[PDB]
Amino acid sequence: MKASVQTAATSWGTVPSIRVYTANNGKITERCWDGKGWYTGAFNEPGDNVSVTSWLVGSAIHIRVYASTGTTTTEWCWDGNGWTKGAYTATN
Amino acid sequence: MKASVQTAATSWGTVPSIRVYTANNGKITERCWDGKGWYTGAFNEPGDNVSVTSWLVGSAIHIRVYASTGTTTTEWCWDGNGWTKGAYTATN
Amino acid sequence: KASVQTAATSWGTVPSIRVYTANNGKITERCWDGKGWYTGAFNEPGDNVSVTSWLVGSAIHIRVYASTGTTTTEWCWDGNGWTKGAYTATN
Ligand SMILES: O=S(=O)(O)c1cc2c(O)c(c1)Cc1cc(S(=O)(=O)O)cc(c1O)Cc1cc(S(=O)(=O)O)cc(c1O)Cc1cc(S(=O)(=O)O)cc(c1O)C2
Ligand SMILES: O=S(=O)(O)c1cc2c(O)c(c1)Cc1cc(S(=O)(=O)O)cc(c1O)Cc1cc(S(=O)(=O)O)cc(c1O)Cc1cc(S(=O)(=O)O)cc(c1O)C2
Ligand SMILES: OC[C@@]1(O)OC[C@@H](O)[C@@H](O)[C@@H]1O
Ligand SMILES: OC[C@@]1(O)OC[C@@H](O)[C@@H](O)[C@@H]1O
Ligand SMILES: OC[C@@]1(O)OC[C@@H](O)[C@@H](O)[C@@H]1O
Ligand SMILES: OC[C@@]1(O)OC[C@@H](O)[C@@H](O)[C@@H]1O
Ligand SMILES: OC[C@@]1(O)OC[C@@H](O)[C@@H](O)[C@@H]1O
Ligand SMILES: OC[C@@]1(O)OC[C@@H](O)[C@@H](O)[C@@H]1O
């Protein structure tokens, strides 16, 4: 037997904002916290595995989510215009 | 399930402090580095999968560990005085 | 089939990003510093991977936790190649 779900998390600021990504049944979904209750975020993309990182540029948050199915990893980018596909490629 | 290690890691400051969480045999445990050697930490909760994030408020560390068993993810919170279950829920 | 597993870290405001992929028992690394993705020097065995990093001034320090079976090896970047770290556990 093995685990059936897999998560990744990032956070920023002192409130804080938290984003938790869960890969389950080939789909990644997003839960969000910014100090007043958990809610479902806009991120919804295919994937059996997820990782995430984020950084601030001044006050603006930038998020990168790496979603993998099979040997294909797709990078998704939050830069202030919704989620967009990133340039990331890998030869797996 | 059969013995098998999966980890998550976070760090803070410049020393740094590092915390590494290991899921194995249905339990998540914690190893700690504060600049002078590895030692075992207080975190010990059920789980087959783990992710983590942390943030500083001044010099106080806050840690959130997302422990998953089956399709249920439980958030565990360190805010300076023991690990407590957080409000996180998801619908997996 | 078999799905790869990744871990990611980033630093600064450009930013720099490092993405580690565990694929068929080996962990490799892809890198971004603002001018395209390229393959990094990290190459170690592992079924599972996590990562963290911190800045000391402008200098990045990266720790990659690579696990096979019940054994986790820490790999350390401190400016001059990857070295095995002191991390141990009794899994
Ligand atoms: O040393 S190895 O990791 O190569 C190994 C492989 C297999 C093995 O059967 C064993 C070791 C022996 C063994 C060890 C353990 S442990 O003490 O937990 O390490 C447990 C078992 C076992 O046979 C029993 C066992 C439990 C389960 S579960 O509880 O349902 O998860 C599944 C299995 C078990 O054998 C099936 C199994 C899985 C796996 S896999 O590593 O998950 O692919 C390898 C082997 C297996 O027989 C095939
Ligand atoms: O395009 S699909 O991904 O849908 C596809 C599905 C199946 C397929 O048979 C193929 C493609 C053809 C095919 C492609 C490739 S590839 O060029 O590398 O992408 C490889 C294979 C293949 O049949 C060979 C193959 C490899 C493996 S593995 O080495 O263990 O990963 C498993 C299988 C293979 O056929 C079995 C298999 C699994 C599955 S699963 O449902 O995804 O588990 C679907 C199909 C399969 O043939 C059924
Ligand atoms: O405030 C919620 C939100 O906009 O935060 C940034 C990203 O996590 C988005 O997916 C998410 O919907
Ligand atoms: O989203 C914009 C972008 O340039 O940000 C830095 C890296 O994440 C790149 O892969 C990505 O295309
Ligand atoms: O000093 C060690 C410790 O208190 O650090 C904060 C948390 O990681 C705790 O679980 C851990 O025991
Ligand atoms: O103080 C604990 C808590 O409020 O911290 C912020 C979030 O992690 C919440 O889910 C959690 O319950
Ligand atoms: O500039 C690329 C590089 O040196 O960056 C630091 C580490 O990620 C190394 O593995 C990598 O080769
Ligand atoms: O300089 C390497 C080292 O001391 O860095 C801090 C920790 O990652 C240790 O396990 C590691 O050996």
Numbering used by the authors:
A (entry chain B), B (entry chain C): -1 to 90
C (entry chain E): 0 to 90
Give the original sentences from the paper that presented this experimental model.
The MKA-RSL – sclx4 asymmetric unit differs to the other structures, comprising two protein trimers and three macrocycles. The other two calixarene-bound N-termini are less well-ordered (and modeled with high temperature factors compared to the structure average) while the calixarene is anchored in position. In the MKA-RSL – sclx4 structure, two of the calixarenes are slotted between sugar binding sites while a third calixarene resides at the interface of three trimers, interacting with three Asn79 side chains.
RSL is a C3-symmetric homotrimer with a six-bladed β-propeller fold and two sugar binding sites per monomer. The three N-termini are located in close proximity at the narrow end, and are typically disordered in crystal structures.
